């Protein structure tokens, strides 16, 4: 049939990002509309702003095809960087976890060389790519994680082009997190190529979503 997508205690944010508690029955192939709660409990476990949330929340309302794929393999695409980053705020069953669709790239051997990863959308469908940018509360943690203080994150596509810089500032304490991670998303049309170049503070994507907005 075409029943609605039930999110339960989860919001669209934690659902699409891969919140460690929002990873059950969410692999549904198609749905007509989304049903959540007036005040969801599980979403962005790591505090941060979700850019273009309403736009994304409306694009994913009616979906006819929906499958996720490892756009960047964890054990294959990040040799010089550490990928096993886990946060206490995104705890799951008494264990510090992280988003399953994103990767917290940090330094390896005290070094963070600039990376350049690209992806060609050869799937004949529209791909939803999501990424984050970390903002440490102090510059001491900025150097500990990414080795550099002048970090840049450039995300360039055929229909998207934006550069990011960290705003080092001590935010209010939310879930024992005085830093922030801003979440950004874009739709990659068939044939488009998205580029990721960064030297720090990049929350790299792991699983994208090849979808098609239909009935």
């Amino acid at each position, epitope marked *: 049939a075409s029943a609605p997508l039930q999110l339960g205690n989860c919001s669209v944010a934690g659902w699409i990002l891969g919140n460690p508690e929002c990873e059950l029955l969410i692999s549904r192939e198609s749905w007509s509309y989304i049903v959540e709660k007036p005040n969801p409990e599980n979403g962005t476990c790591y505090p941060g702003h979700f850019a273009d949330y309403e736009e994304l929340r409306e694009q994913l309302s009616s979906v006819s095809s929906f499958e996720r794929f490892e756009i960047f393999p964890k054990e294959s695409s990040w040799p010089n960087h550490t990928t096993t980053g*886990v946060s*206490a705020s995104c705890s799951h069953n008494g264990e510090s976890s992280f988003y399953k669709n994103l990767l917290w790239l*940090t330094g390896k*051997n*005290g*070094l963070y060389p600039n990376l350049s990863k690209s992806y060609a959308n050869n799937k004949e469908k529209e791909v939803l790519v999501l990424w984050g940018v970390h903002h440490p509360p102090n510059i001491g*943690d900025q*150097r500990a*994680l990414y080795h550099t203080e002048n970090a840049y994150v450039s995300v360039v596509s055929s229909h998207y082009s934006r550069k990011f810089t960290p705003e080092i500032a001590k935010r209010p304490k939310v879930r024992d997190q005085e830093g922030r991670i801003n979440y950004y998303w874009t739709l990659l049309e068939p044939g488009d190529t998205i580029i990721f170049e960064a030297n720090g503070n990049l929350i790299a994507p792991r699983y994208a979503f090849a979808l098609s907005r239909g009935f």
Partner: antibody, heavy 130, light 109 residues
Framework: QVQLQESGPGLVKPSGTLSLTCAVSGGSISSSQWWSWVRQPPGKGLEWIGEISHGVYTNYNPSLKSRVTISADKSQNQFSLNLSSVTAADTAVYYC???????????????????????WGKGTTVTVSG | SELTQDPAVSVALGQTVRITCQGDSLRGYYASWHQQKPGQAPVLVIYGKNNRPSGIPDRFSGSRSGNTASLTITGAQAEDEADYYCASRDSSGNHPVVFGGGTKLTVLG
């Protein structure tokens, strides 16, 4: 992989200045890691002196901050230790070691709240006698 | 904000011993354990919170219960007779490094 190697005079006159040098291969002094100095008096435990991150950032023991300077030479991949106004209580074996990066705040991955000295040097003996 | 250890402890061959290292600074950073044999440089046996480096036997294990950190040697051997120092960072000011008083482990095989 990473190998350390101390180098010093082995003998310093009292009230003098001790100068050591820890050559490092297989690693980079300029990294986010904390390249540290640790000493051990004869028949006593380990005492932490200081550390240097990147090639510029330092941190010292409050019990000896007033006479310790740790510098780094990025060109030769070496970092040195300076200790002035030395006395008989400074005679010890001096080691250089490597420490992991750490976060001062609680907003980091869990692997950034360790402290350890995985890579040590053979250590050099320094006697303050005159 | 100081680390305290037992000055000396003994264990027979094949028996289990637990070295305890207490301190208020263990509530902000994990506790490591370094082994030092006479005439040798220290060797790291525990990264922290029961994480061993490559080449360390699994009979070494760590544990933490609040302000106390414990190193456990299961089935002690003769070559485990050495000095053991705990270490971490203080959670105040510029975060200095604190070392423990040390523990002389004597194997009585």
């Amino acid at each position: 992989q990473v190998q350390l190697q101390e180098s010093g005079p082995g003998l310093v006159k009292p009230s003098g200045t001790l100068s050591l040098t820890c050559a490092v291969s297989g690693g980079s002094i300029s990294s986010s890691q904390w390249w540290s100095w640790v000493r051990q008096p004869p028949g006593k435990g380990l005492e932490w002196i200081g550390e240097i991150s990147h090639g510029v950032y330092t941190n010292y023991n409050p019990s000896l901050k007033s006479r310790v300077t740790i510098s780094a030479d990025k060109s030769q991949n070496q970092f040195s230790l300076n200790l002035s106004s030395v006395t008989a209580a400074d005679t010890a074996v001096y080691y250089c070691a490597r420490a992991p990066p750490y976060c001062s705040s609680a907003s980091c991955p869990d692997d950034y709240y360790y402290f350890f000295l995985d890579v040590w040097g053979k250590g050099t003996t320094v006697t303050v006698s005159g | 904000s100081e680390l305290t250890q037992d000055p000396a402890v003994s264990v027979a061959l094949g028996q289990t011993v637990r070295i305890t290292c207490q301190g208020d600074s263990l509530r902000g950073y994990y506790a490591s354990w370094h082994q030092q044999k006479p005439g040798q440089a220290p060797v790291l046996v525990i990264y922290g919170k029961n994480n061993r480096p490559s080449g360390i036997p699994d009979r070494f294990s760590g544990s933490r219960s609040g302000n106390t950190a414990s190193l456990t040697i299961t089935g002690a051997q003769a070559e485990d007779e050495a000095d053991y120092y705990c270490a971490s960072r203080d959670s105040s000011g510029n975060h200095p490094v604190v070392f423990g008083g040390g523990t002389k482990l004597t194997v009585l095989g």
